[PDB]
Design an enzyme around this catalytic site. Structure first.
Site, PDB file in Angstrom:
ATOM      1  N   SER A 298     124.692 -68.968 -20.442  1.00 43.94           N
ATOM      2  CA  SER A 298     124.360 -70.070 -21.313  1.00 43.94           C
ATOM      3  C   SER A 298     123.622 -71.141 -20.525  1.00 43.94           C
ATOM      4  O   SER A 298     123.860 -71.330 -19.333  1.00 43.94           O
ATOM      5  CB  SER A 298     125.637 -70.626 -21.943  1.00 43.94           C
ATOM      6  OG  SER A 298     125.405 -71.822 -22.662  1.00 43.94           O
TER       7      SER A 298
ATOM      8  N   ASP B  51     136.530 -54.937 -30.052  1.00 45.09           N
ATOM      9  CA  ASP B  51     136.657 -55.739 -28.844  1.00 45.09           C
ATOM     10  C   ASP B  51     135.476 -55.504 -27.923  1.00 45.09           C
ATOM     11  O   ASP B  51     135.433 -54.511 -27.194  1.00 45.09           O
ATOM     12  CB  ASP B  51     137.954 -55.361 -28.125  1.00 45.09           C
ATOM     13  CG  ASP B  51     138.176 -56.146 -26.862  1.00 45.09           C
ATOM     14  OD1 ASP B  51     137.472 -57.152 -26.656  1.00 45.09           O
ATOM     15  OD2 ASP B  51     139.081 -55.752 -26.086  1.00 45.09           O
TER      16      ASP B  51
END
Length: 330
Positions: A199, A35
């Protein structure tokens, strides 16, 4: 040193991925959920409340000659999905794919929430976010990667998750045969303890690319892709009959649909998520309403590039002094 381990979807939907981890001496192999959105290595154990164990493999520290109680240490964690676990702490030898760390903090669960109990395939979590998020008190502990880093050939790990198929976590090297083209690297902020990046935009299907900054985290422990409501609405508007359902808990769509791809930007590069990756199947057995793999982050407080996004790429988690993230197509 290096390590290389195969990671395997837990079910036919890729809800999560498990990777075998050797703990203790002799080794006890547990299948952990790696994770990159958390920083605790915790396991089902011989200390876990018996009624809260249902099929998991447990770590038994008393059977490990290298286990030592970390005296006075406790841990307690709550995840974004509302699940939780807590317990005490041992140090022991932990190996992943041939890479060994001695003195790793292994957090032994005394209690786990129902969602953990109900998932027999996940024996615990191995956190790969920054150690500043580790919950051990009163002395915070380091992640497996942080402990391994100095010994690694290069201070990196990579995630190469499969779509409905196994993939690979590598430590200490970049497998140049595992991706196509080049890797595009992008800046990381560690201010929130995550692999947080920005992004450069998105496209829906064959549509034009929208240049827009989307700050979010690379999180292997989250199943879906969670993005701003504007972006998510633009995606689902291209699917006839798709709608957001408060009763189901997000966007659903007719199972008869063919889903468009979704592209996200990494600098000037582009990663394309095929439409099929966005199908999470019937909302309940036999239903013709299917659950979407792109969902709104509104009210999470952060955008999350979870497995839906990451499995479309070869992803480098570069733990150099100034961390960065790399993405390549594959």
């Amino acid at each position: 040193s290096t390590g290389s381990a195969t990671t395997t979807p837990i079910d036919s939907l890729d809800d999560a991925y498990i990777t075998p981890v050797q703990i203790g001496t002799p080794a006890q192999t547990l299948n952990l959920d790696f994770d990159t959105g958390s920083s605790d290595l915790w396991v089902f154990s011989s200390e876990t409340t018996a009624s809260e164990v249902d099929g998991q493999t447990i770590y038994t520290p008393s059977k490990s000659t290298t286990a030592k109680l970390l005296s006075g240490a406790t841990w307690s964690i709550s995840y974004g999905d509302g699940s939780s676990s807590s317990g005490d702490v041992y140090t022991d030898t932990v190996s992943v794919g041939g890479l060994t760390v001695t003195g790793q903090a292994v957090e032994s669960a005394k209690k786990v929430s129902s969602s953990f109990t109900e998932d027999s395939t996940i024996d615990g979590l191995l956190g790969l976010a920054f150690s500043t998020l580790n919950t051990v008190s009163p002395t915070q502990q380091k992640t497996f990667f942080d402990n391994a880093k100095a010994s690694l050939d290069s201070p990196v790990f990579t995630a190469d998750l499969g779509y409905h198929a196994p993939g690979t976590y590598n430590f200490g090297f970049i497998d140049t045969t595992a991706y196509t083209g080049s890797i595009t690297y992008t800046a990381v902020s560690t201010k929130q303890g995550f692999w947080e990046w920005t992004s450069t935009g998105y496209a829906v299907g064959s549509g034009t690319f929208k240049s827009t900054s989307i700050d979010g985290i690379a999180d292997t422990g989250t199943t879906l892709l969670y993005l701003p409501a504007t972006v998510v609405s633009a995606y689902w508007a291209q699917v006839s009959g798709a709608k957001s359902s408060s009763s189901v808990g997000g966007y659903v769509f007719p199972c008869s649909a063919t889903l468009p791809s979704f592209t996200f930007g990494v600098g000037s590069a582009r990663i394309v998520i095929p439409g099929d990756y966005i199908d999470f199947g019937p909302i309940s057995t036999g239903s013709s309403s299917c659950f979407g793999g792109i969902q709104s982050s509104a009210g999470i407080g952060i955008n999350i590039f979870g497995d839906v996004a990451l499995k479309a790429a070869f992803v480098v988690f570069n733990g150099a002094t100034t961390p960065t993230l790399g993405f390549a197509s594959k």
